[PDB]
Amino acid sequence: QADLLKRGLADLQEHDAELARILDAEVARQQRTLSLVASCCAVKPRTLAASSSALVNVCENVDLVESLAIQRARELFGAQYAGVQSHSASSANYQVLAALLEPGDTLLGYKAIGYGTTKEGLIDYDEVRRLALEHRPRLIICGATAYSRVVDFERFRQIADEAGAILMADISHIAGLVATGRHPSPIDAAHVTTTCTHKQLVGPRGGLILSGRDANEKVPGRDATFSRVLELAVVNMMAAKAAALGYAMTPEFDAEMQRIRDAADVMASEFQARDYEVVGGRSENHTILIRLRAAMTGAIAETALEHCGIVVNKNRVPGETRSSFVTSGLRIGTGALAQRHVDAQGCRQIVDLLCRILDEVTPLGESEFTLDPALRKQFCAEAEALCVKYPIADYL
Amino acid sequence: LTQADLLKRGLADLQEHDAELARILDAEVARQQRTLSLVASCCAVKPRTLAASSSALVNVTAGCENVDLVESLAIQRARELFGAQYAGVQSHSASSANYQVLAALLEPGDTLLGMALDGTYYKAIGYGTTKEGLIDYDEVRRLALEHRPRLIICGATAYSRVVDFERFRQIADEAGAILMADISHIAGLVATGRHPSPIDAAHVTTTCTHKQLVGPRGGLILSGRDANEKVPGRDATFSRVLELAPAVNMMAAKAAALGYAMTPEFDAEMQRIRDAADVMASEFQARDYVVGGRSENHTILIRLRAAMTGAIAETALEHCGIVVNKNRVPGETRSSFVTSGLRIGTGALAQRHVDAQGCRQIVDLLCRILDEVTPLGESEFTLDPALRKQFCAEAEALCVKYPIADYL
């Protein structure tokens, strides 16, 4: 009875055709646009099919979809506990934070204590240690968004276990690599793990609460296991979650994760061969942070690059002398490129186009620039040509 | 590519490769076709609105132009559909919309006469059942003058009669308060002119997009004649403050849902709700069982009799394939959990294109259940062995005779 949705598409085509033009135009736009932004990805069509189930009209099938997602999350991540009802990863974090209430909290950036990065582009774990032994936090939150290196969840847990703290990990940005083993997992390192289904699991907007070896071990104080306390925080997106969790166990997802992982290495190496500095000097994960030219600001780069059809994200660089709104670097993720099945040659072509656009941009201040309209049109056509040579495969 | 082909491949992909899930989702649509639902606000989203929910706009966090185009279509449709001068369509929830408007218009610690009928803000109960099943507007006024709330909220889940939004505005203006209207349960009737509109009477009106408007799980924020008027005590207009001065797949579906309600097929389905309620209210009275003289909306509240308990009534009926909700009556001698009444909504029956003859037969089966079940306790239901088998089969047979039309 998938006829329901197919003939539902037919109702839109006949009666709401205006709306259907915009729906068709976005699919084309997402496919004529080159996307190197780290956490943007196109959700797999199967997951889009489950997101429009008749389970919106809501009952034992609502528990079946829930039980299937819980089982699938536990297999993918090796979780002894799993919770799947979060409508966002932000909610998954706050729900855990609410279950665990005491002023002390250490986080990367309640009485919030903050840590950051070393002046050379790494998490200052020794600062995490010093802050933990001083303020005796309730939990320490680990997990970074723009980091280009493997987060040592084991190190964080060593620090926490000497400061009597709980370790929470947001693996939202590296979830697929953690699931496929390419990135070390925090499932047993962290007491509790949170993740987003959409970013790197190519699924719906939502959240997963997970725990491993500490799931049935007692919370520090409060005479309960981590599984209870988390579960005492009590849908279409359930169906889509289970679809995404299922595809994430397929070998096709393992390949997409290696392509994320391959493209990161060739692109970072190709930036270096053009004397553009990658801050880690290497790429682990799906992200490459490039330190931008002397007069080039990250704000100028992203605005000019989008006008040429490439979307990238400005990011702070180690030793940043500039504002947050106007940076000195940019961040690129190989996520949506893996969905485009870009070979090593294509990744080198993208670095070529990107570095060529920047060499033609004459910065005027820190958020203004000049790019000759003709050169912009020519660059925008090279980008769309690369989009055609490497299309989004599952969208075809 | 096209949205349809992406989705047809998506549906095909979720049958070769993920089949366990496909059976569960396909099982549920069958369950809803054999279950006769008399619940007030449960409905089945239209397939046209459902297909819009598989937009690739989900992948959007200018790349925001098409999301702006979808949004503007929803704003303009919402404004025309309800006759509103301001609209906001980005609410994940009806509750999210209500919370968002409350935060925008109330300062921390402000008092709201929510008339909720069941820390940052203080809430006055507002009751509203005192007038023997009517809203106690006179207490709303008394409390409003005594507590001077910044906000008064109107809109009832289980009311079976028209809410006098104008009367609340009279109360609100006398007590120097803002009026919020939650019309989630009567949205289509206000839409189609059957229930009086709150757009100009209330400063801000909110609505779910699923309960009566047959659309996605979500919320909508509205304002009418008070849109360009500044919030009392503040230097900004209601429209700017309500603008809070990213799920776009739901926003495409809201546009589709708002468009369909403008079509006359929605109007007929609204008349079918209003019509079926009158027939079923009439049959209940002629079988000597309705709070209020008649239904002026989609809800019928029935007082169970002869020590019938709303909890056992609802429990027994599900075993016979009929889904209803227990609901308090004026003069609840029993607990809140064990009511002495039953609540029925005709939204699901309009989607089954049931004739007046069929509505009476459903009441017939319903009363025939209650005339037979023998409450032994206030919760332990009894007297349903093989009689419940033929009764379930008879309900499923009415489901067969009257199918959900738009679900083919």
Numbering used by the authors:
A (entry chain A): 10 to 67, 81 to 131, 153 to 277, 287 to 448
B (entry chain B): 8 to 68, 79 to 135, 150 to 276, 285 to 328, 330 to 448
From the paper:
While GlyA from E. coli, one of the best‐studied examples, catalyzes reversible conversion between serine and glycine and thereby affords mTHF as the major source of C1 unit in cells, the newly identified PbzB involved in the benzobactin biosynthesis catalyzes production of 2‐hydroxymethylserine using l‐serine, d‐serine, or glycine. PbzB, same as GlyA‐type enzymes, forms homodimers with two active sites shared between the two monomers.
The simulated structural model had a confidence of over 95 % and an RMSD of 0.97 and 0.84 for the crystal structures of apo‐PbzB and GlyA from E. coli, respectively. While Y55 and Y65 in GlyA perfectly coordinate PLG, T68 and H78 in PbzB open the space for the binding of PLS. Therefore, one could assume that benzobactin‐producing bacteria remodel an enzyme from the central amino acid metabolism to deliver a building block for the NRPS biosynthetic pathway.
